Amino acid sequence: MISSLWIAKTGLDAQQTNMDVIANNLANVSTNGFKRQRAVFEDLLYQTIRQPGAQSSEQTTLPSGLQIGTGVRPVATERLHSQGNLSQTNNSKDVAIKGQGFFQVMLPDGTSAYTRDGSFQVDQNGQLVTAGGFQVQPAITIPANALSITIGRDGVVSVTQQGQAAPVQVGQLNLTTFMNDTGLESIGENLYIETQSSGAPNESTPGLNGAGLLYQGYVETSNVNVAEELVNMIQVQRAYEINSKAVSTTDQMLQKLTQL
């Protein structure tokens, strides 16, 4: 009902959104292949009133007129695509990416998403799938009586059979790289779908063109730095308290205006 109250509402909304970003980063600390988010804010409208630059006194201009502004709006949340710390779990099926690549996965509805989480499983038919049951591309198939699975640093997959001293290559694990990795739309389940702001999927085997190198037995942990999150808690709390103080002051002013 009054301008200062709307501006303080926008400020409260921005600080709340910062709190959601912090909480989302914290809840996914243990998530493998997670990237922390950071929100960016911009200024809202600026009422012109006295125009800065308009000529007063015929030969003297007016510098810096009344640019009364409105509150704040968050521009967007950008993910920090940096290399998370590698953790050794000693498993034949965990694959960790050390560079800037993505695994390609086919959703059963027909389209393809992209994931960085490398904890892979085997279905009843022998295909390499994600822990959510989504079949990784390409459809690397593992034989029935496998004794050991070796995923090399170039993405080649070998299976050691009984009675064969030489491993047999059963597939080739590729990495997908994009022009802009922040433009991928996160749909949950550690899955990204390609958008028009993220360019087009560039297939590359691991080691060339930039795709990273695949480590076996390692998992890429989340890059969330938690002490920074606590310091951000302290601010996101004071700033919210101060905006609420502004709301209270405007409320008192309106109350005295009403009471007279």
């Binding site: 006295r50 125009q51 308009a54 000529q55 007063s56 006194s57 015929e58 003297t60």
Partner: protein, 50 residues
Amino acid sequence: NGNIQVGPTGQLTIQGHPVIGEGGPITVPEGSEITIAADGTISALNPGDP
């Protein structure tokens, strides 16, 4: 009475009386953010332009 209104075609009128400047009645560029200085200088800003 200093309540100046802008006509559809850009004429400055007070209470329907066309205001008179140094050159006669004033013709304002149709549609403009009019700013009057401390001595009566009129500055017109056309929408969309810089």
